[PDB]
Design a protein around this ligand. Structure first.
Ligand code: GSH
Length: 130
């Protein structure tokens, strides 16, 4: 599914992402925009390390979800990567909150650093009523 901007914003609000581990809703919005353009079916194969990024948040199969074909993903995850390609983003959100529980926080996504960090991200939530 390709979300509309404000439709996603209200959905993330409801799933309790606003201020999760100090990260504002505008920051998660900024992240989804640059990673997948708000598309839950987005997939990116990394030929260099043979891993794949999945879904709206582009979560990687080496440490977070299991897809079986990634080398050195030596078990660990238990969530199937397939769960991150659903139209319902509940699992993807549960997973993104897991990721930021680590020290790096939102900085774990290099796209966040390139495109959102130290920037005015208010634009992503402007007019959504959240
Ligand atoms: N490799 C890390 C993270 C693996 C991990 O927690 N993945 C999450 C998805 S982001 C998961 O499998 N949750 C599935 C579940 O617990 O339903 C660990 O084992 O702590």
């Amino acid at each position: 599914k390709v979300f509309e901007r404000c439709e996603l914003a209200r959905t993330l609000k409801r799933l309790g992402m606003d201020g999760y581990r100090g990260i504002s809703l505008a920051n998660w919005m900024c992240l989804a925009k640059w990673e997948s353009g708000y598309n839950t079916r987005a997939t990116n194969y990394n030929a260099g390390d043979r891993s794949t990024d999945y879904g709206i948040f582009q979560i990687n199969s080496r440490y977070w979800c299991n897809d079986g074909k990634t080398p050195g993903a030596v078990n660990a995850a238990h969530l199937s990567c397939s769960a991150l390609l659903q139209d319902n983003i509940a699992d993807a959100v549960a997973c993104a909150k897991r990721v930021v529980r680590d020290p790096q926080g939102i900085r774990a996504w290099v796209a966040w650093r390139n495109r959102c960090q130290n920037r005015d991200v208010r634009q992503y939530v402007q007019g959504c009523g959240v």
